[PDB]
Every structure is written in structure tokens, then in C-alpha cells.
Amino acid sequence: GFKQDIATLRGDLRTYAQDIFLAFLNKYPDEKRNFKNYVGKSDQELKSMAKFGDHTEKVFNLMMEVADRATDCVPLASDASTLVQMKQHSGLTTGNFEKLFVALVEYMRASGQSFDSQSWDRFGKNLVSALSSAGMK
Ligand code: HEM
Ligand SMILES: O=[N+]([O-])c1ccc(O)c(O)c1
């Protein structure tokens, strides 16, 4: 289920982080607007950049923190607030996060593995609604 998926992901976090983030950027080309240093580079090129692996993993580490602190795939309000208030997230709307988890859910379903896709789908929707309650546009 959800808890095991957190362990699966954390076990090889950098690899999953990159795979899922690439699936997201490729599914929603316009989203690269929030990542000017990633434009005009193939998946394999992005992989070779230090800050791509570093940032993507640090994103997914935080995401696993929030996921693990969640109850029934409902994240803590304080975790959503953290995400809203991050200076790096100044420009963002819940739409950015919604698309990320759409991509994440899609990745899981297409994976050979028994991820609990429905739980992650719920977690994503519940994060979005919590982001809104903590003040994100
Ligand atoms: C649950 C979802 C997310 C989590 C947990 C998360 C977490 C983080 C973390 C930890 C950092 C700092 C990374 C570092 O120190 O290198 C970061 C930076 C950043 N994030 Fe998020 N993030 C999420 C979603 C998003 C989304 C959906 C977008 C835009 C589509 C976004 C855009 C950015 C930008 C622009 C930065 C700083 C510039 C950069 O590192 O690319 N984040 N995020
Ligand atoms: O949301 N993500 O997955 C992100 C956000 C910023 C990054 O620099 C990154 O490599 C991934």
C-alpha cells in the first residue's frame, strides 16, 4: 500500500525522483517555464547535470516526508503550509502540483510494480486541496 510505496521509493529515491520528474516535464512541456535551466535538454542530458539529480531528489525526499506524515493520504496542514511558504514556490499555483501528481500516478500505473496508485492519486488531490487551504492560488 501507501506506506510500502514510500519505502520502495525511498530505497532508490534518486532514480524514481528523476524518472517521475522527467515524466512530468515531458507530459507538460509548458511546465518547464518554472525551470529555465532545464530547457532544451534531453532526459539523458538533464541526468548529467548535478543540480538536476540533487534538486529532484531533494524534492522527492520532502515529498516522502509529507507522504509519511500524512494520515490516510491526507497531508498535515503544516506540511502544506511549508510548501506554500517556500520562497522557491513563490510563483506557483495548485495546478503545478496537480499536474506533478497526475504524472506521478501515471508513472506508477505504467510501472511493472504494484504501487498503490489509487492512494497516490488521493494523496495528490488531498495535497492540492491542502495547498489551497494553506493559501496557495
Ligand atoms: C510535493 C511536491 C513538491 C515538493 C515536496 C517540493 C519540494 C521542493 C524542495 C525541497 C525544493 C528545494 C530543493 C533544493 O534545495 O535543491 C524545491 C525547489 C523548487 N521547486 Fe518544489 N516541490 C514540490 C513541487 C513543485 C512543483 C510542482 C513545482 C513546479 C511545477 C516546483 C518548483 C520548484 C522550483 C522552481 C524550486 C527552486 C528552483 C529549482 O530548484 O528548480 N516544486 N521544491
Ligand atoms: O518538482 N520537482 O520534481 C522539481 C522541482 C525543482 C527541481 O529543480 C527539480 O529537479 C524537480
Question: What would you report as the CA-atom Rg of the chain, rounded to the nearest whole angstrom?
Answer: 14
Q: What is the CATH number of the domain that holds 14?
A: 1.10.490.10
Q: How was this structure determined?
A: X-ray
The position carrying cell 503545478 is: 96
**Ligand 1 mutation pick, 27, 30, 51, 55, max ligand atoms within 8 A of CB:** 55
Smallest CA-to-CA distance from 11 within 127, 24, 3 is with 3
- C-alpha 65, offset from chain centre: 12
The cell for 3 is: 506506506
DSSP 35: -
Spacing, Cα 89 to ligand 1 middle (Å): 7
Cell of 98: 496537480
Which residues constitute the domain of residue 16? Answer: 1-137
Three-state secondary structure of 37-78: HHCCCCHHHHHHCHHHHHHHHHHHHHHHHHHHHCECCECCHH
Structural domain total, the chain: 1
Å resolution of this model? Answer: 2.0
Q: State the amino acid at position 30 in one-letter form.
A: D
